[PDB]
Amino acid sequence: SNEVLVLRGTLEGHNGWVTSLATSAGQPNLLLSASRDKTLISWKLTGDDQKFGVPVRSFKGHSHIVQDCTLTADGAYALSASWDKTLRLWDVATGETYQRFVGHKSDVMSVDIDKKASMIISGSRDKTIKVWTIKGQCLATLLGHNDWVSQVRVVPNEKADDDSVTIISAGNDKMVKAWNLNQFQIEADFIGHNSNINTLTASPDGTLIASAGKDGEIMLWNLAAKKAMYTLSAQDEVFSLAFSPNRYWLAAATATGIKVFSLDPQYLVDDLRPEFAGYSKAAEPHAVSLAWSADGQTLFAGYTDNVIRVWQVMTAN
Amino acid sequence: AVPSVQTFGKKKSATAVAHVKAGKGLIKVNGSPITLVEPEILRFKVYEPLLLVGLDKFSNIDIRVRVTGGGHVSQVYAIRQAIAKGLVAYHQKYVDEQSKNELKKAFTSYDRTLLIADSRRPEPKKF
Amino acid sequence: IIKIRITLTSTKVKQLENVSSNIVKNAEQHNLVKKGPVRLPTKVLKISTRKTPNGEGSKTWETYEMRIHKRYIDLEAPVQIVKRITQITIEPGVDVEVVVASN
Amino acid sequence: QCRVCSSHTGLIRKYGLNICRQCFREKANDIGFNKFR
Amino acid sequence: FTPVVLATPIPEEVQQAQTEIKLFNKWSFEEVEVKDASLVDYVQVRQPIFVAHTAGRYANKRFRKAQCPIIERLTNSLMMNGRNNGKKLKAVRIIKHTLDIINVLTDQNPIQVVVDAITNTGPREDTTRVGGGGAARRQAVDVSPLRRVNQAIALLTIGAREAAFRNIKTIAETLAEELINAAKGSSTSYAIKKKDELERVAKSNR
Amino acid sequence: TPVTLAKVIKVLGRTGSRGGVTQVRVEFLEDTSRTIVRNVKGPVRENDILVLMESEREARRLR
RNA sequence: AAUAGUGGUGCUAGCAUUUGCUGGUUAUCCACUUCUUAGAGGGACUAUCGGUUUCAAGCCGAUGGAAGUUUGAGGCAAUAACA
């Protein structure tokens, strides 16, 4: 009837905090995982309710905290954005990266890849946005903000490549701007968040844009009408966001647990809240990054004490 | 070509570079087999990285190390610093991580200073 | 059109990275063959002398210091290219030398 | 030589400068010596 | 057990039981023996050892001092005066030339003969190290266990120097007979018969 | 022999001309209701085993 | 980076020899920076948990960490009778 999520595993391979996990659309058997501890870790999803087996590779190439990792659909390559103005073009088999980047003055905060595999966007903490080639060449800088930037997202162009690519950004000046690539221009200005914008993701259809900051203001947006349909108050601090790829469930990663919603109507199914031991109660660990399956049937959640737990989407009884 | 890596280990200004290659398994301390080191009492200190994991993983390796500096005592500590951390570079470039950590846990359960060198430099006097 | 070698051994480290930059700047605007500025281990001078004019008092001393840095570049160029640019990179406290050793 | 300040002894024969060391502490600045440690 | 070969010709005898869980090249650590309830906590460091020589970092907080091995501690005490400060390599030669001369003297475990020996020589009572404020007296007092083991080992050691000073016999010949004397309650060795009379006047004063 | 098998509970403070001895709170194992102090000399902490002879005659405090 | 060093290609000597382990040196040439040196930056803040205290300033454990005794050691800092 409903999506209950029982505990299916636990990963222990880090000593920072995780910063971005990454699944492959093609390959359902691995997991890319990045963390604060200057490491990149690619996993092996050995389906077992005692553990999940092998972190098959490690990538020792950086000097500080990395922020977000991205990859191809089949699992061909991997990218990394570490705080020391560095970007690396990794393989997935050996560990040998390709080319570092010289393009910023700050932490490179968020990057993304087009599915046509031609341009790589980059937004960094020095209030500028940069695009890169596959061989790694500068094309155009982009300005417009005045505070920092947190996340940048490319639109899911599921309309059979009808020259429709656009970049949406999560700044830090309580501002959400939309940036074209084909014409290289501001597209839409999104207004309404009152504090530091923390995260944004759009629908897997590329149609419904969710945005939520520090106060817990989940403000929904459309792709074309681009309006404030739902303005949910998450009454907490949310760090990252979550969209079910196949279904219509939008989820949020608050500091007080894990909350889930349906698109229509409003169904608070579960609070994914794990269990710990040995704490004065002002010290409960909490997650910051989470990810779905390739079919939306498993959910991952990495936490501050380097535990990554997994669940499975079975029907409610 | 051949899987090959370099490590190095220091103690009290005494260096010990290492060259790892692949072969039947030869462990060469400055152009000599390892079973001939002149502080005969400390002969088993160099045996400790080998005698922790079993004699198995070495029919596909080749080890040539050379040292400079230090006295006749520190160089015994310097060689087993580079050798023990020299084995993991195979298992952090070629062989997987589950094979890496099991001996990582095996070393540092027994000796923290087999992986991480000491930090106890000398000191200036009447100044 | 001869391989040359330039040395510069000065004692103001801020006023040696401006000079070594504009050396490799105008050579690369003419795109000659070169090898990078190799930086040698520096030399320090010291003299311990006790701190009293007379001799009556307790005893520990001073220690004075002076630091000499030295780095050098090898180069090849036509002589008309180099004989002008070595005369516009002057600065006080700085020494410049040219060596055309091609044994 | 006896240079100046009641000294012909304790001369600094090193580095070829030949200064009486009573009259070195006041001249060690402008030579370019400085203390740091 | 299946002696594998390498391109190095490796001797087998360093691989027979050494690759097995027996660790020291002639003895083991299966033999665990508790006599006092004080020694249960810290003296028998349950860790392996091969040579009894490492760079311990225990001298920067007074309880990490406890975790060093016993055999390492007795070698440290052999630097006695201005001729052997820093001759650690000389000391381990002495010690590995003493367990051999222990076990050939009609017994069963050469590491056993010292761990029972320090049970006797941890002095249960004590004087105080005070006069008293003019009346140079000695009052009621007892000893901490972590202090107890410290002076326990050290008074065994210092007797051997004069036992081997200026006479034909060697150091290893002294340390043989001294510890088996210290193994039992005999009070015939100087390692015993000076801690006893301390405890006897302590039975008076208080 | 009359053993006295003892366990320290609470540490109180050093006392003496030099503070060379320390007064603690110690418990008897064989009778777990024996609150008593003891003038123990040495580095002391929690959870130690204390050999002892004179089970009652002890100075409760020092100058 | 021929005013540091390894990695090969060679001329070249041993070679148990038989695949091989040690050599060979100006220039046999190419490719390298880990070790080396010196510029530019980074990194530690007592961090994170557990005790303790007017719950304050802090002090003790803990695991991580190259580093957790002001992180180790120095330089530099004017009131005064040695006529």
Q: Is A160 left (phi over 0), alpha (psi -120 to 50) or beta?
A: left
Q: How far apart are CA B20 and CA B2, in angstroms?
A: 10
Token digits of residue E164: 């081997």
Q: Could you give phi then psi for residue A271, rounded to 5 degrees? A: -110, 105
3-state helix, strand, coil in chain D (%, to 5): 25, 10, 65
Q: Cα torsion at C90, C92, C95, C96 (round to 10°)? A: 0
Q: Please give the DSSP secondary-structure letter assigned to residue E100.
A: H
Å separating the CA of residue C41 from the C1' of nucleotide G37: 6
Q: Answer yes or no: are the C-beta atoms of A205 and A221 closer than 8 Å.
A: no
Q: How far apart are CA A154 and CA A164, in angstroms?
A: 10
Q: Report chain A's C-alpha Rg in angstroms.
A: 19
Whether B25 has its CB under 8 Å from any CB of chain E: the answer is yes
What is the extent of the structural domain holding F56? 1-63
Whether F2 has its CB under 8 Å from any CB of chain E: the answer is no
Give CA separation, E27 vs A224, C101, E23, E50, E108, in Å.
Answer: 80, 69, 7, 10, 11
Q: How far apart are CA A212 and CA B22, in angstroms?
A: 54
Å separating the CA of residue B23 from the C1' of nucleotide G36: 29
Q: Which residues of C touch D15 (CB under 8 A)?
A: 45, 47
Closest chain B residue to E53 measured between Cα atoms?
A: B42
Closest to A176 (Cα-Cα) out of A205, A218, A207: A218
Q: Is the dihedral of CA A185, A190, A194, A196 positive or negative?
A: negative
Q: How far apart are CA B88 and CA B94, in angstroms?
A: 10
Residues of C with CB under 8 A from a CB of B: 60, 63
Q: Answer yes or no: are the C-beta atoms of F48 and E144 closer than 8 Å.
A: yes
The per-residue b/e assignment along A143-155, b for 16 or more CB within 10 angstroms, e otherwise, is ebbeebbbbbbbb
Closest to A305 (Cα-Cα) out of A270, A271, A279, A272: A279
Please count the structural domains in chain F: 1
Q: How far apart are CA C31 and CA C20, in angstroms?
A: 16
Q: How far apart are CA A304 and CA A287, in angstroms?
A: 6
3-state helix, strand, coil in chain C (%, to 5): 20, 35, 45
Alpha carbon of A93: minimum distance to chain B alpha carbons (Å) = 10
Whether D37 has its CB under 8 Å from any CB of chain C: the answer is yes
Q: How far apart are CA B19 and CA B82, in angstroms?
A: 10
Question: Within a 10 A sphere around the Cβ of A82, how many other Cβ atoms?
Answer: 21
Q: Answer yes or no: are the C-beta atoms of A117 and A157 closer than 8 Å.
A: no
Token digits of residue F31: 């009778």
Please count the structural domains in chain B: 1
What is the extent of the structural domain holding B18? 1-127
Tell me if residue A114 falls in helix, strand or coil: coil
Does the C-beta of B6 come within 7 A of strand G?
Answer: yes
Helix axes E171-183, E145-163, angle to 10 degrees: 140
The per-residue b/e assignment along A235-255, b for 16 or more CB within 10 angstroms, e otherwise, is eebbbbbbbbbeeebbbbbbe
Per domain, the residue ranges of chain A are: 8-317
Annotation: binding site of D? 2, 5, 20, 23
Q: How far apart are CA B79 and CA B16, in angstroms?
A: 6
Q: Answer yes or no: are the C-beta atoms of E34 and E53 closer than 8 Å.
A: no
What is the extent of the structural domain holding C36? 1-103
Q: What is the DSSP string of A196-251?
A: -EEEEEE-TTS-EEEEEESS-EEEEEESSS---S-EEE-SS-EEEEEE-SSSSEEE
Annotation: binding site of D for Zn(2+)? 2, 5, 20, 23
Q: Please give the DSSP secondary-structure letter assigned to residue C40.
A: P
Residues 6+ apart with CB under 8 A from B41: E51, E89, E92, E93, E96
Give the resolution in Å.
3.7
| Nucleotides, chain G, CB distance < 7 Å | 1-3, 6-7, 21-23, 34-43, 48-51, 61-62, 64-69, 72-76
Q: How far apart are CA E162 and CA E167, in angstroms?
A: 9
Tell me if residue A59 falls in helix, strand or coil: coil
Alpha carbon B58 to its chain centroid, in Å, reads 14
D32 contacts C11? CB cut-off 8 A:
yes
